Write a protein that binds this ligand. Structure first.
Ligand code: HEM
Length: 137
């Protein structure tokens, strides 16, 4: 289930974080307008850049924490607040997060692996809700 999925992802987090993030950027190309530095680069080019590997792992490090602290796929309000009030997210709307989680769910559904994709879908929607509550547009 969800909890084990957290453990699975953590067991190879750099690889999962990059593959999921790339799935997100490839599905929603318009989203690269939040990451100018990634434009015009193939997946392999991105994976070899320093800031890509570093930023994305750090994203998933915290995502997994937020996931881990959730109850029944409902994140802590404190965690939602943190994500909203991060300077690096000044721009974002919940739509950005929505898309990330659609790609994440899609990735999991197409993997050979018995991820609990329905729980990640709930998690994504509940985080979006919590981010709305904590003040993100
Ligand atoms: C649960 C979801 C997410 C978590 C946990 C998260 C977490 C983080 C963290 C920890 C950083 C700092 C990384 C660093 O600079 O070392 C970061 C930076 C950033 N996040 Fe998020 N993030 C999430 C979703 C998103 C989404 C959906 C977007 C845009 C669609 C986004 C855009 C950014 C940008 C633009 C930066 C910094 C600039 C860059 O390095 O590209 N984040 N995020």
């Amino acid at each position: 289930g969800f909890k084990q999925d957290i453990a699975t992802l953590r067991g190879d987090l750099r690889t999962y974080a990059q593959d999921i993030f790339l799935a997100f950027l490839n599905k929603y190309p318009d989203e690269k307008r939040n990451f100018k530095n990634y434009v015009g680069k193939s997946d392999q080019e991105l994976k070899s850049m320093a800031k890509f590997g570093d930023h994305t792992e750090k994203v998933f490090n915290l995502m997994m924490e937020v996931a881990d602290r959730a109850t029944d796929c409902v994140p802590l309000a404190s965690d939602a607040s943190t994500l909203v009030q991060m300077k690096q997210h000044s721009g974002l709307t919940t739509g950005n997060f929505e898309k990330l989680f659609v790609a994440l769910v899609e990735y999991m559904r197409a993997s050979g692996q018995s991820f609990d994709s329905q729980s990640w879908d709930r998690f994504g929607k509940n985080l979006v809700s919590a981010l709305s509550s904590a003040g993100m547009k």
